[PDB]
Amino acid sequence: TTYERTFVKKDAETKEVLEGAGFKISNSDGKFLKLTDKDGQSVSIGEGFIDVLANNYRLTWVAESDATVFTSDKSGKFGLNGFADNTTTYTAVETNVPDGYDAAANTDFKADNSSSDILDAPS
């Protein structure tokens, strides 16, 4: 059994869904998520939810500068599956902020198969 997490990026005031908000995910060790293929090679992802399972990708933990950026799609959605447990705490860190917004505060989460909103304050 594996777990997933979804987020929806929204304007804090209007709740408009925001596209193109980019996030890195950190763990308690202060390392950041980098997806690889089964053979350790880098992969290209687009916006939205990433089906790690269907792609047989692997989760690895690297310096922030080397991490995968996960990006909200046109509906504001992003996330991934392939997490090993629902008990570990991670942090979603906004690194690429849409125009007209201030970054959301970092968001602690567990891979608990839920969806939650991440709010960007309009500038």
Q: Are 16 and 8 in contact (CB under 8 A)?
A: no
Cβ-in-10-Å burial (0-12, 13-18, 19+) of 75 comes to: middle
Q: Which domain holds residue 37?
A: 1-123
Cβ atoms < 10 Å from Cβ of 10: 19
Which two tokens mark 47? 């916006």
What is the four-CA torsion angle of 90, 83, 43, 9, rounded to 10 degrees?
-50
- Helix, strand, coil percent values for the chain (each to nearest 5): 5, 45, 50
Distances (CA, A) of 24 to 1, 65, 66, 67: 24, 10, 10, 7
Q: Is the dihedral of CA 90, 92, 63, 35 positive or negative?
A: positive
Rounded to whole angstroms, the Cα distance separating 8 from 26 reads 18
Task: State the sign of the Cα–Cα–Cα–Cα dihedral 104, 6, 40, 27.
Answer: positive
Amino acid at 56: N
Among residues 68, 75, 81, which one has the least CA distance to residue 10?
A: 75
The CATH number of the domain holding residue 25 is 2.60.40.10
User: Structure resolution in Å?
Assistant: 1.6
Alpha helix stretches (DSSP H) within 5-117: 52-55
Q: How many domains does the chain have?
A: 1
